[PDB]
Design a protein around this ligand. Structure first.
Ligand SMILES: CC(=O)N[C@@H]1[C@@H](O)[C@H](O[C@@H]2O[C@H](CO)[C@@H](O[C@@H]3O[C@H](CO)[C@@H](O[C@@H]4O[C@H](CO)[C@@H](O)[C@H](O)[C@H]4NC(C)=O)[C@H](O)[C@H]3NC(C)=O)[C@H](O)[C@H]2NC(C)=O)[C@@H](CO)O[C@H]1O
Ligand SMILES: [Cl-]
Ligand SMILES: [Cl-]
Ligand SMILES: [Cl-]
Ligand SMILES: [Cl-]
Ligand code: NA
Length: 129
């Protein structure tokens, strides 16, 4: 599924990301836009042989098992394919673990480079939240 912006905001809000670890919802929507273009089915291979999955491009090196990243962890205890679902529940639950793991939303390169220190509440502009 490719979400619309406010559609994603509402999903992320209802699954608990708004202000999660102090990151207002616009941070998460912004991150998703530049990680995956709001596309739950996005996949992107990394040089180390891991792959990033879903709306929030969650990495198989650490967070999910994709069958083809040897020596990696599965800290979210999910198949990576769970992160490609139209339903973003697993993505959001996994995101919560990631952001709680020490580096906050610096875990998301697109967040660091395109969202951190910017007007992220604009990502929730107009939304019925
Ligand atoms: C090619 C490219 O850049 N692709 C992007 C992907 O990298 C990306 O996924 C993110 O990948 C990084 C690097 O593998 C990963 O970051 C690492 O995460 C772990 C786990 O949280 C850190 O380990 C913890 O460090 C803290 C603080 O030092 C410790 O206190 C804690 O104990 C550690 N936990 C464990 C289990 O060991 C690493 O320090 C950190 N490494 C680096 C180099 O930063 C992120 O979590 C990945 N992010 C996500 C969302 O999965 C993907 C998404 O941004 O985007 C690609 O473009
Ligand atoms: Cl919703
Ligand atoms: Cl959802
Ligand atoms: Cl933080
Ligand atoms: Cl916000
Ligand atoms: Na893994």
């Amino acid at each position: 599924k490719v979400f619309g912006r406010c559609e994603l905001a509402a999903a992320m809000k209802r699954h608990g990301l708004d202000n999660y670890r102090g990151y207002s919802l616009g941070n998460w929507v912004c991150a998703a836009k530049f990680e995956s273009n709001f596309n739950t089915q996005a996949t992107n291979r990394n040089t180390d042989g891991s792959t990033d999955y879903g709306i929030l491009q969650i990495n198989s090196r650490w967070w999910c098992n994709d069958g083809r990243t040897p020596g990696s962890r599965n800290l979210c205890n999910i198949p990576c394919s769970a992160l490609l679902s139209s339903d973003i529940t697993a993505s959001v639950n996994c995101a919560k673990k990631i952001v709680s793991d020490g580096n906050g939303m610096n875990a998301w390169v697109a967040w660091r480079n395109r969202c951190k220190g910017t007007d992220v509440q604009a990502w929730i502009r107009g939304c019925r939240l």
